[PDB]
Short mmCIF file of C-alpha atoms and ligand atoms in Angstrom, two decimals:
data_model
loop_
_atom_site.label_atom_id
_atom_site.label_comp_id
_atom_site.label_asym_id
_atom_site.label_seq_id
_atom_site.Cartn_x
_atom_site.Cartn_y
_atom_site.Cartn_z
CA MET A 1 0.27 11.35 -0.41
CA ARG A 2 3.30 9.72 -2.03
CA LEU A 3 3.66 5.95 -1.77
CA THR A 4 7.21 4.66 -2.22
CA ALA A 5 6.96 0.90 -2.63
CA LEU A 6 9.81 -1.60 -2.99
CA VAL A 7 8.72 -4.83 -4.71
CA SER A 8 10.64 -8.08 -4.16
CA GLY A 9 10.48 -11.41 -5.97
CA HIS A 10 10.61 -12.61 -9.56
CA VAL A 11 9.66 -9.19 -10.90
CA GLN A 12 12.22 -8.00 -13.51
CA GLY A 13 11.98 -9.03 -17.16
CA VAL A 14 8.27 -9.83 -16.92
CA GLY A 15 6.63 -6.52 -17.87
CA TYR A 16 6.11 -5.40 -14.27
CA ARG A 17 6.82 -1.70 -14.90
CA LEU A 18 4.40 -1.51 -17.84
CA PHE A 19 1.81 -3.30 -15.69
CA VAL A 20 2.23 -0.73 -12.88
CA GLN A 21 2.01 2.15 -15.32
CA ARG A 22 -1.26 0.86 -16.81
CA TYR A 23 -2.93 0.53 -13.41
CA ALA A 24 -1.53 3.81 -12.07
CA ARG A 25 -3.02 5.60 -15.08
CA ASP A 26 -6.33 3.72 -14.52
CA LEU A 27 -6.33 4.92 -10.90
CA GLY A 28 -5.46 8.58 -11.45
CA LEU A 29 -1.96 8.35 -9.97
CA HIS A 30 1.32 9.99 -10.99
CA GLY A 31 4.89 8.89 -10.45
CA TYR A 32 7.13 6.20 -11.89
CA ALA A 33 8.29 2.59 -11.78
CA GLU A 34 12.00 1.79 -12.00
CA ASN A 35 14.09 -1.37 -11.91
CA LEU A 36 16.77 -1.44 -9.19
CA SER A 37 20.13 -3.14 -9.59
CA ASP A 38 19.48 -5.26 -6.48
CA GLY A 39 16.63 -7.06 -8.29
CA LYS A 40 13.72 -5.08 -6.84
CA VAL A 41 11.28 -2.71 -8.52
CA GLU A 42 10.67 0.72 -7.00
CA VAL A 43 7.25 2.33 -7.48
CA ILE A 44 6.59 5.99 -6.64
CA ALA A 45 2.91 6.90 -6.80
CA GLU A 46 1.21 10.14 -5.79
CA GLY A 47 -2.49 10.66 -5.27
CA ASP A 48 -5.48 9.86 -3.14
CA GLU A 49 -4.99 7.46 -0.23
CA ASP A 50 -7.60 4.97 -1.42
CA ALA A 51 -6.21 4.94 -4.96
CA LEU A 52 -2.79 4.13 -3.52
CA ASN A 53 -4.38 1.16 -1.70
CA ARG A 54 -5.98 0.00 -4.95
CA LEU A 55 -2.59 0.25 -6.67
CA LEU A 56 -1.05 -1.83 -3.88
CA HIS A 57 -3.52 -4.63 -4.67
CA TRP A 58 -2.04 -4.78 -8.17
CA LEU A 59 1.56 -4.37 -6.96
CA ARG A 60 1.17 -7.49 -4.86
CA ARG A 61 0.03 -9.56 -7.87
CA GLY A 62 1.96 -8.34 -10.87
CA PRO A 63 1.45 -9.60 -14.39
CA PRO A 64 1.32 -13.14 -15.53
CA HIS A 65 4.46 -14.85 -14.67
CA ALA A 66 5.60 -12.43 -11.97
CA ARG A 67 6.13 -13.92 -8.51
CA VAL A 68 5.80 -10.99 -6.11
CA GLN A 69 7.01 -12.07 -2.69
CA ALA A 70 6.64 -8.76 -0.80
CA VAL A 71 5.90 -5.05 -1.13
CA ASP A 72 7.55 -2.70 1.41
CA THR A 73 5.72 0.59 1.73
CA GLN A 74 6.65 4.06 2.98
CA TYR A 75 4.63 7.27 2.74
CA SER A 76 5.61 10.91 2.37
CA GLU A 77 4.16 14.16 1.06
CA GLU A 78 3.25 14.61 -2.61
CA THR A 79 5.72 16.69 -4.60
CA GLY A 80 3.45 17.37 -7.57
CA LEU A 81 4.79 14.80 -10.00
CA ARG A 82 3.01 14.69 -13.32
CA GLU A 83 2.41 11.68 -15.56
CA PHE A 84 3.46 8.11 -14.83
CA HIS A 85 6.78 6.98 -16.34
CA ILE A 86 8.91 3.84 -16.49
CA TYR A 87 12.69 3.93 -15.96
NA1 NA B 1 7.77 -3.45 -18.03
NA1 NA B 2 14.37 -0.27 -14.95
#
């Protein structure tokens, strides 16, 4: 399925997108991570349900110096995205 996750907290400017991309690639997932102008990070990830749960473990922690306060999740059908990009 597709996970669309919205990450709140001290998350921009701390390498969060690169962190997500590394773990998504480790977990066989495709999609993207993008900074939002309201201060959040949006993560779209497509792939197996358990891999999405493993990614969520990382999304809730973030890199060194991130302070992730919450991760809102919503699920939808995969669209066939390839690769994992940062925007
Ligand atoms: Na980054
Ligand atoms: Na961005």
